[PDB]
């Protein structure tokens, strides 16, 4: 089963660059491409889709 | 007007039950993992959707294979070690009364004896401390095993600590794992997957209490080949563990004497300080709530209005009558009278202490004529374990009374392996099939 | 249906699928058929796997289907083995149920395939002489 | 004779029959070629059986006769190997007498077939190159 | 040719030669890939050789290239695996260097090859259905 | 008649100090010595 | 220990060498299986 772990700074100053890293651990070694994406939800608001990328191409 | 012809398909996903030899994989020890194929870093577990498979824990060949493998490994480990044939002699034994408590009166015997040396023509007068369960009076005493067979001393280097063992099938064979929770161990399983190897199963040897095992993910599980049959053992799996702290507080001193050319016998010289009985502590509240969960689960099988009581063990040998196990080399037998002693009505920091007796002459498997001597462990010893399950037996079974009596069980280590291999089965793949199709050669 | 990847099933992921769906994963199952207390056991297991694989390959060869995952044959399918039509065979059941159903007639089909292959070989030899 | 039934010969039933008649039972003989100290002896026996079976399979393959019970080859039959006609060979004597007769000319024939198949595959590769 | 010797090409002789020249000596490599403490390890040596040869043969078979030295396949060559030109690789590189170059793409190519072989088998079945 | 082949146009990296052949030969020789010494007398009573 | 004992006595027992077994080195060829 694919497992995802997120990491990054808990506090970032205003007008700076926020860097987040999500690592992927997959138990299957055969060649497979997933579609990864980032989704943020503000406190008390609905979810928002930031962006995504393929796991085998720069698209 | 059909015109259907045979077509051969190679590689169809078909399997059926089979018996094979599963080989070991692991990440000086009694369980030889040096010869096992190292486990893959990322095990492959493929879920079989739309697959319902019949499982049966009580007729699984994996349990028999694991039992035979464990006995073979034990024999291999004991093969290159000293044989205590000269140890069978007349012993002049006195009572150990130096700094001992009232509960330890007569348990230890200070025994002096003549013994061989490096040279065949020389003898040495030596002394040792022997547990009361190990010596039988002929002041004249002899080891208990002398009139049965010789004993092979356990080598001090090999460690008795269990190591996880993964069982893997060869090519052309598959291992099916039942992922369905709340599983009885017998019948259909709709949630089934296939694994190249089983999970790490530590070969823990224990009676009346499954230690360092696997926990149920939802609630306490009751399993039995025939629950209505009082002669069938009941396997109970806890959803949460119960911490048990087992300790021998004696500061045992090991002295090694030369008994021959390159042969050393490790005796217990003296206990440094006070002498007191080894014992096991278990939290009272945790045990009470676990017993309540077990009672509520058993009520589903034996009726909501029945009376459930936990009582003595029936009787027999010390291995079955008491909770037998090992704690870092020293072999403990603990009187589990305070645990299974209560009744339940269908309406703090203190802990329960179980006294324990240490033994050196041992018989792990149900065999006669093959014994082992456990060298003493230097100093105090303590261990912490997870009680994750129970082996129970139902007494009587008459319908005259509404009460049900459950007693601790054990003795057969096949049940211990069954509690871990209940969800696993082995099948052989059949890639050849014939089907009807309109295609023609 | 725009942001999506692709993951392919494993060794037996197609077991619960229909026959038609499972017929595309034959190679996946095929490739996995070949790969003192622990030594002799492993050696015997390897020998047993080799023997089983070679037995299957020999059966395929004597049926004239050597080196073919799917191979049509000249043996007709009579209604005695199975009265079920193709519509409910390749779209309403899996291969395990098929093995359960026609386990009794497997040897008869195998013998008929062997005899058909022998007859085909003899006919080919006779034709090739001309 | 109406109402007779049928029973088919077993492993080596056609051993003493004519070669033409014995050629119908190739599959029966083919299927029978694969199926502590004594453990070692049995392991040696079965391993050697597997090695011999693979030797036969590769020997057939180096002639291009993979998976074929009866396989025709381009090697001409030299007269000095046997001056008998087809009628006297395929209808008046068995396979054992044949093998006894051509035991001397076996290795040379095998080499001839081997080199013929080598030339054939080289020619096929050259033709497919263009 | 009266006065002439025999220079027998050797095993792995064209290892250092270019791929184009080394592809002409596949036979000398392929023809001989199968052929108390001493005997016990000789046994497992034989078993290892047999199983390696059988796995290679199975891999050849599941790609539809059984009994062939050069096998043209239907899967296209993805340029991402190697951007090098045909004349570059076939005249300025050896087989060992190619193996080092594409050592991390062998599994994907093998999977595509076996999938394409399965698709070809299904297409042949459909063609024979008419 | 041992059959040697020259690998012309070939260069290979060798390392004698990490060769598995040496370890295999050592193990085989030790096993042979252990085997040869098993089926004859053990001089246990000689210690006097 | 005039009194003497074998050096190996306090280490381990000694196995007498088989008398008919020769210690002459013999050439050995270490040959790999097929595919190697
Ligand atoms: C359930 O699991 C738990 C947790 O894993 C188990 O509890 C562990 O038990 C092990 C051993 O049973 C214990 O490890 C020992 O801890 C001691 C403290 O560190 C050490 O004394 C000891 O090391 C000695 O023994 C090893 C062999 O066991 C040797 O390799 C090592 O060199 C040491 O031996 C030297 O010292 C002794 C004593 O002086 C001497 O006789 C020797 O000759 C040598 O000089 C072990 O590391 C863990 O600490 C325990 N963990 C916990 C949390 O309690 C529990 O036993 C399991 N239950 C069951 C039933 O299996
Ligand atoms: C067990 O007995 C031995 C011998 O009978 C005791 O060892 C003696 O200890 C006393 C007091 O320390 C010494 O004076 C003697 O010289 C010792 N004798 C020998 C032969 O060693 C030993 O103390 C006893 N142990 C226990 C626990 O009672
Ligand atoms: C060790 O051996 C000695 C010598 O045999 C034993 O001492 C003998 O004991 C017997 C029986 O009591 C007497 O008849 C002898 O006279 C004793 N001989 C000597 C030299 O003392 C001694 O008892 C043995 N020790 C043990 C612990 O069994
Ligand atoms: C006893 O049980 C506890 C509780 O289940 C175990 O602690 C777990 O250890 C595992 C190690 O694989 C961790 O993943 C879990 O997160 C732990 N859980 C908790 C609640 O701490 C403990 O390891 C067990 N001990 C033994 C010896 O079996
Ligand atoms: C479970 O055990 C019970 C009790 O033995 C079995 O029922 C008994 O079956 C025998 C068969 O001869 C009868 O003589 C007894 O009278 C039955 N006793 C009761 C209480 O029913 C029962 O068959 C067993 N179940 C299974 C599935 O084997
Ligand atoms: C088991 O529990 C008993 C008490 O029921 C413990 O005995 C205490 O041990 C501590 C050691 O920290 C001493 O300070 C106390 O004086 C002891 N009290 C009594 C009444 O004996 C015992 O130590 C516990 N053992 C384990 C292994 O946890
Ligand atoms: C068994 O021993 C463990 C320590 O190994 C005990 O855990 C302690 O529990 C007390 C609560 O009474 C806590 O204050 C301590 O911090 C715990 N210690 C550790 C190291 O976590 C446990 O209580 C003991 N159990 C029994 C039944 O005696
Ligand atoms: C069963 O429980 C009873 C009482 O709780 C125990 O019986 C005692 O056994 C000892 C030793 O045989 C006798 O000296 C006592 O007189 C018995 N008491 C009674 C009231 O009968 C018995 O030990 C328990 N069984 C086990 C295995 O611990
Ligand atoms: C296990 O523990 C119980 C509880 O202490 C023991 O039963 C006691 O036995 C003694 C005899 O030595 C009696 O005096 C007590 O009255 C008994 N207590 C109870 C509560 O019944 C039992 O004997 C122990 N088992 C063994 C095998 O020693
Ligand atoms: C498991 O079975 C279900 C149905 O039992 C399959 O879902 C069907 O898929 C087919 C074609 O793929 C559709 O025509 C049906 O309408 C579907 N049925 C339902 C109820 O949705 C499902 O694909 C099977 N899973 C696998 C992995 O083969
Ligand atoms: C065994 O041999 C006999 C005689 O050698 C065979 O009988 C001949 O059969 C053929 C046709 O099969 C006839 O043309 C001949 O006239 C028969 N000869 C005689 C003398 O009867 C018989 O067929 C052989 N049987 C087998 C099973 O090989
Ligand atoms: C090793 O390299 C040499 C040259 O470096 C190769 O010889 C070349 O062979 C090709 C094709 O036959 C000729 O076109 C070249 O002119 C040759 N070069 C020279 C310098 O003579 C040689 O073939 C390679 N080794 C092997 C075994 O193929
Ligand atoms: C040793 O103590 C036990 C238990 O108290 C007693 O039965 C025995 O008679 C004693 N033996 C002696 C003093 O020799
Ligand atoms: C050995 O002796 C004990 C007690 O002395 C007895 O119970 C047992 O049956 C004896 N065993 C044999 C094999 O004689
Ligand atoms: C588990 O097995 C028992 C024993 O036959 C059966 O009666 C019960 O229905 C099974 N339980 C489940 C949940 O399948
Ligand atoms: C046991 O005795 C030894 C030697 O006297 C001492 O070093 C050690 O600390 C003692 N251990 C305990 C737990 O008292
Ligand atoms: C026991 O009580 C529960 C309610 O707590 C009830 O659902 C259950 O059915 C009862 N058990 C039986 C066997 O009827
Ligand atoms: C068993 O429980 C009873 C109360 O029912 C109590 O009096 C007795 O002491 C208990 N025995 C043990 C050994 O815990
Ligand atoms: C054996 O004795 C020798 C000489 O007395 C001594 O050097 C050696 O250490 C001893 N070895 C052992 C294992 O006792």
From TrEMBL, chains C, D, E:
Residues 100-130 form a coiled coil. Residues 1-21 are annotated as: Fusion peptide. The chain crosses the membrane at residues 1-24. This is Transmembrane protein gp41. The gene is env. It is a single-pass type I membrane protein. Glycans are attached at residues 78, 85, 104. The chain holds residues 509 to 660 of 860 of the full protein. It is found in: Virion membrane; Host cell membrane; Host endosome membrane. Residues 41-59 are annotated as: Immunosuppression. Disulfide bonds join 65-71.
Automatic annotation (TrEMBL), chain F:
It is found in: Host cell membrane; Host endosome membrane; Virion membrane. It comes from the Viruses. Glycans are attached at residue 9. Highly glycosylated by host. The high number of glycan on the protein is reffered to as 'glycan shield' because it contributes to hide protein sequence from adaptive immune system. Palmitoylation of the transmembrane protein and of Env polyprotein (prior to its proteolytic cleavage) is essential for their association with host cell membrane lipid rafts. Palmitoylation is therefore required for envelope trafficking to classical lipid rafts, but not for viral replication. Envelope glycoprotein gp160: Oligomerizes in the host endoplasmic reticulum into predominantly trimers. In a second time, gp160 transits in the host Golgi, where glycosylation is completed. The precursor is then proteolytically cleaved in the trans-Golgi and thereby activated by cellular furin or furin-like proteases to produce gp120 and gp41. Transmembrane protein gp41: Acts as a class I viral fusion protein. Under the current model, the protein has at least 3 conformational states: pre-fusion native state, pre-hairpin intermediate state, and post-fusion hairpin state. During fusion of viral and target intracellular membranes, the coiled coil regions (heptad repeats) assume a trimer-of-hairpins structure, positioning the fusion peptide in close proximity to the C-terminal region of the ectodomain. The formation of this structure appears to drive apposition and subsequent fusion of viral and target cell membranes. The CD4-binding region is targeted by the antibody b12. Belongs to the HIV-1 env protein family. This is Envelope glycoprotein gp160. It comes from Human immunodeficiency virus type 1. The chain holds residues 79 to 126 of 860 of the full protein.
TrEMBL record, chain G:
Highly glycosylated by host. The high number of glycan on the protein is reffered to as 'glycan shield' because it contributes to hide protein sequence from adaptive immune system. It is found in: Host cell membrane; Host endosome membrane; Virion membrane. Signal peptide: none annotated. Envelope glycoprotein gp160: Oligomerizes in the host endoplasmic reticulum into predominantly trimers. In a second time, gp160 transits in the host Golgi, where glycosylation is completed. The precursor is then proteolytically cleaved in the trans-Golgi and thereby activated by cellular furin or furin-like proteases to produce gp120 and gp41. Belongs to the HIV-1 env protein family. The mature envelope protein (Env) consists of a homotrimer of non-covalently associated gp120-gp41 heterodimers. The resulting complex protrudes from the virus surface as a spike. There seems to be as few as 10 spikes on the average virion. Surface protein gp120 interacts with host CD4, CCR5 and CXCR4. Gp120 also interacts with the C-type lectins CD209/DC-SIGN and CLEC4M/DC-SIGNR (collectively referred to as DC-SIGN(R)). Gp120 and gp41 interact with GalCer. The CD4-binding region is targeted by the antibody b12. This is Envelope glycoprotein gp160. It comes from Human immunodeficiency virus type 1.
């Amino acid at each position: 089963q694919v497992q995802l772990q997120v990491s990054g700074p808990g506090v970032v100053k205003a007008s700076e660059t926020l860097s987040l890293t999500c690592d992927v651990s997959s138990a299957s070694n055969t060649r497979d491409y997933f579609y990864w994406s980032w989704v943020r939800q503000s406190p008390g608001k609905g979810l928002e889709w930031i962006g995504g990328v393929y796991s085998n191409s720069d698209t | 007007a059909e015109n259907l012809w045979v077509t051969v398909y190679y590689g169809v996903p078909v399997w059926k039950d089979a018996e094979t030899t599963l080989f070991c994989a692991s990440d000086h020890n009694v369980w030889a993992t040096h010869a096992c194929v190292p486990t893959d870093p990322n095990p492959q577990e493929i879920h079989l959707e739309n697959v319902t498979e019949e499982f049966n824990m009580w007729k699984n060949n994996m349990v028999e294979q694991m039992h035979t493998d464990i006995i073979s490994l034990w024999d291999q480990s004991l093969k290159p070690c000293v044989k205590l044939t000269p140890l069978c002699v007349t012993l002049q034994c006195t009572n150990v009364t130096n700094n001992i408590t009232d509960d330890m009166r007569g348990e230890l015997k200070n025994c002096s004896f003549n013994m061989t040396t490096e040279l065949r023509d020389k003898k040495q007068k030596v002394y040792s401390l022997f547990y009361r369960l190990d010596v039988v009076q002929i002041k004249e005493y002899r080891l208990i095993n002398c009139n049965t067979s010789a004993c092979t001393q356990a080598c001090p280097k090999v460690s008795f600590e269990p190591i996880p063992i993964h069982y893997c099938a060869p090519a052309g064979f598959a291992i099916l794992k039942c992922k369905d929770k709340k599983f009885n161990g017998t019948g259909p399983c709709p949630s089934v997957s296939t694994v190249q190897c089983t999970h790490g199963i530590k070969p823990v040897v224990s009676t009346q209490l499954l230690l360092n095992g696997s926990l149920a993910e939802e609630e306490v599980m009751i399993r039995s080949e025939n629950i209505t049959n009082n002669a069938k053992n009941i396997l109970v799996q806890f959803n949460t563990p119960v911490q048990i702290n087992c300790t021998r507080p004696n500061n045992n001193t090991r002295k090694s004497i030369r008994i021959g050319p390159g042969q050393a016998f490790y005796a217990t010289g003296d206990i440094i300080g006070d002498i007191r009985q080894a014992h096991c502590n278990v939290s009272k509240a945790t045990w009470n709530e676990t017993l309540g969960k077990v009672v509520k689960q058993l009520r589903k099988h034996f009726g909501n209005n029945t009376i459930i009581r936990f009582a003595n063990s029936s009787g027999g040998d010390l291995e079955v009558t008491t909770h037998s196990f090992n704690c870092g080399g020293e072999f403990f037998y603990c009187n589990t009278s305070g645990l299974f002693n209560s009744t339940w009505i269908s309406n703090s920091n203190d802990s329960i202490t179980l006294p324990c007796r240490i033994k050196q002459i041992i018989n792990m498997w149900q065999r006669i004529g093959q014994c082992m001597y456990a060298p003493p462990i230097q100093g105090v010893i303590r261990c912490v374990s997870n009680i994750t399950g129970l082996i129970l037996t139902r007494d009587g079974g008459s319908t005259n009374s509404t009460t049900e009596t459950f007693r601790p069980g054990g003795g057969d280590m096949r049940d211990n392996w069954r509690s871990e291999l209940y969800k696993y089965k082995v099948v052989k793949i059949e890639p050849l099939g014939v089907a009807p199709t309109r295609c023609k050669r | 249906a725009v942001g999506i990847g692709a993951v392919f099933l494993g060794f037996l992921g197609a077991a619960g699928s229909t026959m038609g769906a499972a017929s595309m994963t034959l190679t996946v199952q095929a490739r996995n058929l070949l790969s003192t207390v622990w030594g002799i056991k492993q050696l015997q297991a390897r020998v047993l796997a080799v023997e089983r694989y070679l037995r299957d390959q020999q059966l395929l060869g004597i049926w004239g289907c050597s080196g073919k995952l799917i191979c049509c044959t000249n043996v007709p399918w009579n209604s005695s083995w199975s009265n079920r039509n193709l519509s409910e065979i390749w779209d309403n059941m899996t291969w395990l149920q098929w093995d359960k159903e026609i386990s009794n007639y497997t040897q008869i089909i195998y013998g008929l395939l062997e005899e058909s292959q022998n007859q085909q070989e003899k006919n080919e030899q006779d034709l090739l002489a001309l």
